[PDB]
Design a protein around this ligand. Structure first.
Ligand SMILES: C=CC1=C(C)[C@@H](Cc2[nH]c(/C=C3N=C(/C=C4\NC(=O)[C@H](C)[C@H]4CC)C(C)=C\3CCC(=O)O)c(CCC(=O)O)c2C)NC1=O
Ligand SMILES: C=CC1=C(C)[C@@H](Cc2[nH]c(/C=C3N=C(/C=C4\NC(=O)[C@H](C)[C@H]4CC)C(C)=C\3CCC(=O)O)c(CCC(=O)O)c2C)NC1=O
Ligand SMILES: C=CC1=C(C)[C@@H](Cc2[nH]c(/C=C3N=C(/C=C4\NC(=O)[C@H](C)[C@H]4CC)C(C)=C\3CCC(=O)O)c(CCC(=O)O)c2C)NC1=O
Ligand SMILES: C=CC1=C(C)[C@@H](Cc2[nH]c(/C=C3N=C(/C=C4\NC(=O)[C@H](C)[C@H]4CC)C(C)=C\3CCC(=O)O)c(CCC(=O)O)c2C)NC1=O
Ligand SMILES: C=CC1=C(C)[C@@H](Cc2[nH]c(/C=C3N=C(/C=C4\NC(=O)[C@H](C)[C@H]4CC)C(C)=C\3CCC(=O)O)c(CCC(=O)O)c2C)NC1=O
Ligand SMILES: C=CC1=C(C)[C@@H](Cc2[nH]c(/C=C3N=C(/C=C4\NC(=O)[C@H](C)[C@H]4CC)C(C)=C\3CCC(=O)O)c(CCC(=O)O)c2C)NC1=O
Ligand SMILES: C=CC1=C(C)[C@@H](Cc2[nH]c(/C=C3N=C(/C=C4\NC(=O)[C@H](C)[C@H]4CC)C(C)=C\3CCC(=O)O)c(CCC(=O)O)c2C)NC1=O
Ligand SMILES: C=CC1=C(C)[C@@H](Cc2[nH]c(/C=C3N=C(/C=C4\NC(=O)[C@H](C)[C@H]4CC)C(C)=C\3CCC(=O)O)c(CCC(=O)O)c2C)NC1=O
Ligand SMILES: C=CC1=C(C)[C@@H](Cc2[nH]c(/C=C3N=C(/C=C4\NC(=O)[C@H](C)[C@H]4CC)C(C)=C\3CCC(=O)O)c(CCC(=O)O)c2C)NC1=O
Ligand SMILES: C=CC1=C(C)[C@@H](Cc2[nH]c(/C=C3N=C(/C=C4\NC(=O)[C@H](C)[C@H]4CC)C(C)=C\3CCC(=O)O)c(CCC(=O)O)c2C)NC1=O
Ligand SMILES: C=CC1=C(C)[C@@H](Cc2[nH]c(/C=C3N=C(/C=C4\NC(=O)[C@H](C)[C@H]4CC)C(C)=C\3CCC(=O)O)c(CCC(=O)O)c2C)NC1=O
Ligand SMILES: C=CC1=C(C)[C@@H](Cc2[nH]c(/C=C3N=C(/C=C4\NC(=O)[C@H](C)[C@H]4CC)C(C)=C\3CCC(=O)O)c(CCC(=O)O)c2C)NC1=O
Ligand SMILES: C=CC1=C(C)[C@@H](Cc2[nH]c(/C=C3N=C(/C=C4\NC(=O)[C@H](C)[C@H]4CC)C(C)=C\3CCC(=O)O)c(CCC(=O)O)c2C)NC1=O
Ligand SMILES: CCC1=C(C)/C(=C/C2=NC(=C\c3[nH]c(/C=C4\NC(=O)[C@H](C)[C@H]4CC)c(C)c3CCC(=O)O)/C(CCC(=O)O)=C2C)NC1=O
Lengths: 164, 162, 172, 177, 248, 113, 20, 177, 177
């Protein structure tokens, strides 16, 4: 993947160097910031059914043309493969909060994704309408702490800017 | 081998009976205690080289004649210093066997049966080994019931030497 | 007499090795099962008289020459010795089940039972039919709940049937 | 490559699971003992030049036919290539101790190493012996039980880091055997 | 980065006199002259083409790329002009598979073998966006080509000692062969194709044919198997004073 | 010391369910006459049977559906079936035109659909 | 033999940019 | 009585059980929307003889290599055995629609099904094609969008049950994949 | 000499029964695994000469008193017989793995081996110690986890053939005890 540890040991490997003191200064910051992003990870783990339920129907409320015949959300199995493909993305945000890097997003969920949605006529604006709904639905002292919300929202709009 | 499992089987075989609940409760007590016994065995194995070479130095500091006096019985040469640290490692290895098994059965068989005749023959003092075993009891760094399990076999070895 | 924990300690001491972390974890899987092994043994010893008596009554109905006059289980002396020989084998299988290792089974029951019955004239073919009848009477009794929290115990009842298979090939 | 947090999320990806609070208690103790992991790897890279030259010349000591005519540490050409190789092995196991997962040692260093050595003529039994010396040098710097060079640590056990790095040195012997 | 084979047991790499001639304002380069010129062109023809043995009526179609090379003395522009030729695609693109064409671009233009499936699949990502000229100019205008060869020397097979993967040295030795070896002998059929996509390695006798003179070419083979078992878990124990510790 | 046929027959009996090849299935019947006290559901168990005769209304009709496909007789090409173990006698009016295929010909009878 | 302070095709550029 | 409706399946023999008029009247107030679900399973099993007759013939309709000489729905009896197992799948799905869960389906019909088809040489890439024709018939018959036959239903929406009976047909397709 | 098929007939002849029913269904699953057993006998016979010379050498490195003057493996006449004594044991175990029944091992090799070895003066402690090395090699070759050579098989699990070949090698050590 790409994380804080794989950055500094592949920067060290290309120079032929041992782990120096600047590389161990980085992973001190992985220790200090971990209690934030492992609280947002285990909050999204035990609440993932209700946050993809609300993200799914905010897609079709903004775009009700998908339930026109011939379109993407034609029948109920195509509605059900829309709620699955946004439950895949909230799994990868949970994978990115645990790893502490953008690694599981850009090679399990973003790599190849513009090619497959262009062929299969899926609009990307419906995908970013769901993810941007959950970024505003977060509030600061109830759903997590104030620093877990900065980690959780930063992995949400990295996914938004990759699809835009 | 004297384990809590094979003391229950040997109790039922000496009476010619099936395993009643008197023997199923003794086996169940080993399973309830095997959590703390098997983490103590992992933590003493990972600290083996630190505890052996540190406890050989504790004997050389309390009994400093054992590095000066000539003769085959002392740690005064290359082969005597090598045989002293080999014996601390024998004692540490049998404690980890007793924690895995669950009773003082490995070191009764492999270590204490015939140990008094060996120390008197080869002129080894049993107060040397007590001092190295008091170092291991005060330097493994374990806490709680994991330390209670490890300490109960370290001073079983002390009571056979003292 | 070795149980399953002492089987790996004895094999380590022949090379002078500490036990590794991958061997402590394999032993804590046995502590993890634990309560389900104790209910295999509790179900066998609490029905031990029905397991032996129903398997003997079915054995003589199949080989009736064993209780004919002049047969090997005629004359109460020989009949009563046939019944405790079946209860001896069922006793040591339940010993080997609670230990996890078949050391007490084939050291002090099975070691020399083929050539014990050969010197007496006892048909060891017919003894193996009696082990097989006590085998499936015990594995049908092991995998029923009847006041037991329901789970998967099929890796333990495959171990219990392997002890009965070990006793069966050893007497003939 | 992966590290100790990436290894957990590829296990959950085979089940399409979420990394929840049951799986997170291994990762919450990796960051809890994470100061000692950093405290152990500058105990190794501070002594790494002494560790290589002692392990290679300690292999020459138990096998003097490596430096006779026909040994494969004979001239200056072959001895500097052996000293370079033991520094590469010690470099990749310091990456693997830092990550907490032996992925980067196994694909970059160890993958294909057995076929280089049986084409260049390198003896693999004595090459395992140079790795097995510096395994014992590495566990003595971590637990602070070396005869020279006492470093200044804080008090407690590092006994699970000393056997984690001993398993990384054991993968080098298993891959060239 | 010591590399005990490189300038010891092989030759020295050929090329132009210096790279300071470009900053000279009355010339373009140390002018070699047509005996010092064409013996450098003999080494570019033996390296971009393998030993293809190009005829007199095949070199006449490469007349224009040499006439620019003897005025503009850049070696990298000569290699770029020879890889877009008909004589480079009729030998390495026309009757071959796609990973056979890709594995010869690493041989002819970098002197190494490809290290990965991820590095190899990105060269087919450039085939989709510009054809075969997008593969060739991205190798030539890379950072790895700049800090090993530049405009000055021919791209030669370099024994580095400090390879970024050990498998990269293995695939370099399979790709180059002996000096009596061209690269048309397989019928298409990339040699490295199974080992890149699976992650295994090469065969020891195929690598030791291509090693230089004086480097124990083949010894060390035990008479059991040549690769490793990934599923094997061996017990490797260390002696302490008391017993033997299996730190696994 | 082990019995291989006993402890693998027991291992294949607890992992594999006892219920697969017996071809039983819950047949549900709904009865409804509109009223409230007429609305039973009967979920009983029947071993269903392989109906031999109505497969020829499926196997033959699809064999002449695929006979008349112009573009499924190519990209779905059948294998090269050997003829049977009939012996050649020597007269061609029995060898080439046997009694099982004597005077047989297809008659096509079109109607509406 | 590469001599790191060196380029290849901005050397083409600036001789046809100082004239411009 | 729904717990007794699993009793008639578990005995590996025939037992018939039913509910009364007053018993079902308690059942439809206990469970949610049960008048739709009994209308759901009646719409399938009234047309169940046409559903496996169209799906198995629809499998040959795009894959005529099964009735090719050398295929697997050749020689007179394998076609009859395929029509039996198509009707086996339809009664377990319609019982899973009736009971409301897939808990009787995955252990008593799909458990062991993948290893049985590859032992016999049944082409499992075409049996998923025969299930998806039966899935496409089932969502037509629930939502009354069947073109050749229109039943008489009370008005309303049944797309929750049609997504439920589609999801049981993927569970048959996931086990044989 | 019984195979696995002759054992279920001898057991049925004692009660005078026809073989059929449940023990005919246990026999049809024994032959379903009959290719795994044939795949795995080949993975031991192919490596049979390295398996013996490694087990005899590994018994010697543990007890170097066998190659001292006066040891049992001392002279060339006695070294060649231990290499022969140790591959007959491996040969007769491969018969029992092919047959699936340890009858040919128990009577043609093991009956009276202990009385033979303590009449020639062969240390039965070391013979056990070489047989237990060959046990670890045979479980590694069957499960394809050898560190020195990986073979090619179809994908799947063969952990019941490793449990069976370990029981044969444990029986060799218990017999010559
Ligand atoms: C994993 C991440 C995660 C989230 C982002 C939230 C998202 C979220 N919020 C609500 C539900 C709610 N959330 C809020 C909170 C607010 N609404 C506002 O208008 C205020 C701006 C804000 C105060 C902070 C309120 C008031 C409700 C109930 C009303 C509603 O449905 O929005 C629900 C419905 C279930 C519930 O009530 O808990 C969910 C899933 N929950 C999560 O588990
Ligand atoms: C781990 C990451 C990961 C993903 C995100 C998904 C991505 C994904 N979704 C779909 C597949 C689909 N995705 C949708 C999705 C939608 N329709 C809409 O109206 C919206 C655009 C959106 C719901 C919000 C639909 C309708 C299909 C079916 C399209 C088809 O049948 O071709 C497919 C095609 C194959 C299939 O059917 O499974 C893929 C690869 N898969 C992954 O592995
Ligand atoms: C002194 C005598 C003595 C015993 C008999 C056992 C009795 C016993 N067994 C279990 C606990 C158990 N017992 C079983 C056993 C089985 N389940 C089945 O369906 C099979 C019929 C059988 C297989 C052998 C299982 C599976 C559990 C754990 C429950 C579970 O996790 O599913 C527990 C509770 C443990 C816990 O969960 O905390 C107890 C006290 N223990 C004893 O100390
Ligand atoms: C033939 C010649 C010959 C040698 C060169 C040495 C080589 C050597 N060194 C060590 C062993 C060691 N080597 C070192 C390394 C060092 N110690 C320091 O304090 C320095 C910082 C650093 C470079 C000298 C350490 C820390 C140990 C182990 C701890 C110890 O010696 O107690 C070991 C023991 C490894 C083992 O037990 O397997 C051996 C064989 N021995 C020989 O027989
Ligand atoms: C990233 C992974 C990586 C490695 C592991 C090394 C592996 C490696 N070693 C050597 C090359 C060599 N390696 C050795 C090493 C040894 N011979 C011995 O007898 C000792 C046992 C042992 C030293 C400990 C020698 C002697 C050569 C040179 C062989 C020769 O001159 O013919 C080469 C050939 C390249 C060259 O030198 O030009 C390579 C790839 N390099 C890497 O890039
Ligand atoms: C950026 C570089 C960087 C480092 C080099 C380390 C430096 C370091 N090590 C420890 C801290 C520690 N280090 C040890 C380790 C040991 N004590 C012993 O007796 C053993 C010999 C040795 C085992 C290897 C222990 C036991 C602690 C305290 C436990 C803990 O807080 O983690 C601490 C925390 C305590 C403190 O703040 O003072 C720090 C900052 N951390 C970093 O961030
Ligand atoms: C694709 C574009 C392209 C062109 C348009 C031509 C143009 C061209 N000609 C020459 C190069 C030359 N051209 C000539 C030709 C002549 N000199 C004379 O006196 C005659 C009048 C005339 C023949 C008609 C000669 C003699 C040289 C070589 C000069 C030298 O020896 O340095 C060069 C320099 C390269 C070199 O050093 O050889 C170039 C670019 N070649 C090309 O590649
Ligand atoms: C179910 C049984 C069945 C049939 C018997 C035929 C009968 C038939 N033929 C055509 C339709 C036709 N039939 C012909 C054929 C001919 N016209 C000529 O001028 C030629 C003399 C003759 C050639 C043999 C032509 C040219 C058309 C119109 C083109 C077409 O519809 O494809 C139509 C469609 C007419 C309409 O759309 O209303 C029908 C039903 N088709 C069937 O499906
Ligand atoms: C309740 C449990 C139960 C099932 C789940 C089904 C599954 C099933 N089908 C068959 C058996 C079969 N199944 C098929 C089916 C097919 N071949 C095809 O080409 C099509 C893809 C598909 C039908 C649409 C055929 C052709 C046979 C017979 C195989 C033969 O006789 O060679 C068998 C026979 C195995 C045996 O008897 O040992 C079983 C268990 N039948 C059951 O009894
Ligand atoms: C076993 C016997 C048995 C049945 C078959 C059902 C039959 C049934 N369902 C409904 C009643 C209904 N049935 C449906 C169902 C549907 N409507 C649609 O548009 C879809 C096509 C279809 C879904 C599959 C709906 C939506 C209602 C009304 C809401 C309700 O009563 O649940 C009614 C009342 C209609 C009326 O008032 O006359 C009856 C008798 N109940 C039973 O006890
Ligand atoms: C059917 C199975 C079968 C066997 C097992 C052997 C058994 C066997 N071995 C030896 C003979 C021997 N066997 C050994 C073997 C050993 N000594 C050791 O120290 C090692 C521990 C061990 C090797 C692993 C030796 C050294 C001899 C030679 C004794 C002698 O020469 O007097 C002899 C004496 C006759 C002869 O040598 O020809 C016999 C019958 N033969 C068989 O037919
Ligand atoms: C003192 C000297 C000495 C020896 C000779 C060896 C002897 C030896 N070999 C192995 C262990 C083994 N031996 C082999 C056998 C082979 N492996 C191959 O790659 C070849 C094909 C084949 C013969 C060359 C195998 C396959 C294993 C286990 C797994 C593996 O190594 O891949 C074991 C481990 C037993 C265990 O795990 O408990 C031992 C002690 N060890 C020593 O300490
Ligand atoms: C006369 C020569 C002769 C042989 C050598 C064997 C060769 C052989 N082995 C297997 C087939 C197989 N072999 C294995 C065995 C293994 N797979 C593993 O992962 C383990 C490492 C190893 C031992 C457990 C497995 C799992 C199969 C798959 C089929 C099955 O389960 O039986 C097959 C059938 C599959 C195929 O056709 O490819 C054959 C022919 N049979 C013969 O007739
Ligand atoms: C596994 C169970 C086991 C135990 C417990 C054991 C003890 C043991 N320690 C011995 C010797 C020894 N032990 C020592 C140890 C010491 N002397 C000192 O000065 C130090 C203070 C002290 C070290 C802490 C020495 C120097 C010898 C050699 C004595 C001799 O050779 O006469 C000997 C004599 C064997 C020999 O000559 O090497 C035995 C049998 N052996 C065993 O097999």
């Amino acid at each position: 993947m790409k994380s804080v540890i794989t950055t500094v040991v592949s920067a060290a490997d290309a120079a032929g160097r041992f782990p120096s003191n600047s590389d161990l200064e980085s992973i001190q910051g992985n220790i200090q910031r971990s209690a934030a992003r492992l609280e947002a990870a285990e909050k999204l783990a035990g609440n993932h059914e209700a946050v993809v339920k609300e993200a799914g129907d905010a897609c079709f409320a903004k775009y009700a043309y998908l339930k026109n015949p011939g379109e993407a959300g034609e029948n109920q199995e195509k509605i059900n493969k829309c709620y699955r493909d946004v439950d895949h993305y909230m799994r990868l945000v949970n994978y990115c909060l645990v790893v502490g890097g953008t690694g599981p997003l850009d090679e399990w969920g973003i790599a190849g994704a513009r090619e497959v949605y262009r062929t299969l006529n899926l609009p990307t604006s419906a995908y970013v309408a769901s993810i941007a709904y959950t970024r505003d639905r977060l509030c600061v002292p109830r759903d997590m702490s104030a620093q877990a919300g900065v980690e959780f929202s930063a992995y949400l709009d990295y996914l938004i800017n990759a699809l835009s | 081998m004297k384990t809590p499992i094979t003391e229950a089987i040997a109790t039922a075989d000496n009476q010619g009976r099936f395993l009643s609940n008197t023997e199923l409760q003794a086996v169940n007590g080993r399973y309830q205690r095997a959590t703390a016994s098997l983490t103590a065995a992992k933590a003493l194995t990972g600290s083996a080289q630190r505890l052996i070479t540190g406890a050989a130095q504790a004997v050389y500091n309390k009994f400093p004649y054992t590095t000066q006096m000539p003769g085959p019985a002392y740690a005064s040469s290359a082969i005597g210093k090598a045989k002293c640290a080999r014996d601390i490692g024998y004692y540490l290895r049998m404690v980890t066997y007793c924690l895995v098994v669950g009773g003082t059965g490995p070191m009764d068989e492999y270590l204490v049966a015939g140990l008094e005749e060996i120390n008197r023959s080869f002129d080894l003092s049993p107060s040397w080994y007590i001092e190295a075993l008091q170092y291991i009891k005060n330097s493994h760094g374990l806490s709680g019931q994991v330390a209670n399990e490890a300490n109960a076999y370290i001073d079983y070895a002390i009571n056979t030497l003292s | 007499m070795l149980d399953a924990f002492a089987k790996v300690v004895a094999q380590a001491d022949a090379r002078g090795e500490f036990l590794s972390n991958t061997q402590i974890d394999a032993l804590s899987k046995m502590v993890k099962e634990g309560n389900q092994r104790l209910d295999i043994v509790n179900k066998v010893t609490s029905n031990a008289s029905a397991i032996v008596t129903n398997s003997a009554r079915a054995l003589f109905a199949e080989q009736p020459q064993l209780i004919q006059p002049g047969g090997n289980a005629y004359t109460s002396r020989r009949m009563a010795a046939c019944l405790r020989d079946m209860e001896i084998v069922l006793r040591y299988v339940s010993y080997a089940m609670i230990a996890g290792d078949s050391s007490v089974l084939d050291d002090r029951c099975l070691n020399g039972l083929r050539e014990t019955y050969q010197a007496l004239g006892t048909p060891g073919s017919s003894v193996a039919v009696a082990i097989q009848k006590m085998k499936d009477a015990s594995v049908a009794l092991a995998n029923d709940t009847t006041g037991t929290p329901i789970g998967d115990c099929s890796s333990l009842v495959a171990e219990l049937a392997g002890y009965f298979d070990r006793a069966a090939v050893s007497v003939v | 490559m992966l590290d100790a947090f990436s290894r957990v999320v590829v296990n959950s990806d085979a089940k399409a699971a979420y990394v929840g609070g049951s799986d997170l208690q291994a990762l919450k103790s990796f960051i809890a003992d994470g100061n000692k992991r950093l405290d152990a790897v500058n105990s190794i890279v501070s002594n790494a030049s002494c560790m290589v030259s002692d392990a290679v010349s300690g292999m020459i000591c138990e096998n003097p036919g490596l430096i006779s005519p026909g040994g494969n540490c004979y001239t200056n050409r072959r001895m500097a290539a052996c000293l370079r190789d033991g520094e590469i092995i010690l470099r990749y196991v310091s990456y693997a101790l830092l990550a907490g997962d032996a992925s980067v040692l196994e694909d970059r260093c160890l993958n294909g190493l057995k076929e280089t050595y049986i084409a260049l003529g390198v003896p693999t039994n004595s090459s395992i012996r140079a790795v097995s010396i510096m395994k014992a040098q590495a566990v003595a710097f971590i637990t602070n039980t070396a005869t020279e060079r006492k470093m200044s640590f804080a008090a407690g056990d590092c006994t699970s880091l000393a056997s984690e790095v001993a398993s990384y040195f054991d993968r080098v012997g298993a891959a060239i055997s | 980065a010591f590399s005990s084979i490189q300038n010891v047991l092989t030759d020295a790499p050929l090329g132009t006199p210096s790279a300071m001639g470009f900053l000279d304002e009355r010339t373009e380069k140390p002018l070699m002259g047509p005996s010092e010129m064409d013996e450098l062109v003999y080494a570019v023809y033996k390296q971009v083409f393998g030993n293809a043995h190009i005829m007199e009526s095949e070199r006449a179609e490469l007349r224009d790329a040499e006439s620019l090379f003897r005025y503009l003395r850049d070696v990298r522009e000569f290699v770029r002009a020879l890889a877009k030729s008909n004589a480079y695609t009729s030998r390495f693109l026309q009757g071959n598979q796609q990973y056979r064409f890709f594995e010869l671009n690493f041989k002819h233009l970098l002197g190494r073998g490809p290290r990965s499936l991820e590095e190899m699949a990105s060269h087919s990502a450039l085939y989709a966006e510009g054809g075969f000229e997008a593969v060739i100019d991205a190798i030539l205008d890379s950072d790895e080509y700049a800090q090993e060869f530049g405009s000055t020397v021919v791209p030669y097979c370099r024994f580095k000692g400090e390879y970024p993967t050990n498998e990269e040295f293995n695939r370099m030795l399979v790709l180059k062969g002996a000096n009596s070896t061209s690269d048309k002998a397989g019928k298409g059929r990339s040699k490295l194709c199974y080992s890149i996509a699976a992650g295994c390695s090469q065969n020891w006798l195929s690598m030791s044919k291509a090693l230089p003179f004086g480097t124990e070419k083949g010894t060390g083979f035990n008479l059991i198997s040549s690769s490793r078992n990934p599923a094997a878990r061996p017990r490797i124990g260390t002696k302490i004073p008391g017993g033997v510790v299996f730190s696994s | 010391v082990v019995l291989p046929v006993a402890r693998a027959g027991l291992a294949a009996t607890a992992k594999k369910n006892q219920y697969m090849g017996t071809s039983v299935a819950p047949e549900i019947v709904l009865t409804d006459k509109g009223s409230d006290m007429s609305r039973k559901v009967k979920t009983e168990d029947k071993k269903v049977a392989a109906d031999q005769a109505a497969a020829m209304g499926i196997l033959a009709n699809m064999s002449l559906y695929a006979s008349l496909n112009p573009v499924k007789r190519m990209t779905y090409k059948a294998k090269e079936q050997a003829p049977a173990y009939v012996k050649k006698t020597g007269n061609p009016v029995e060898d080439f035109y046997p009694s099982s295929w004597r005077n047989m010909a297809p008659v096509i009878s079109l109607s509406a659909n | 033999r590469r001599t790191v302070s060196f380029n290849a095709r901005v050397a083409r550029n600036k001789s046809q940019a100082k004239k411009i």
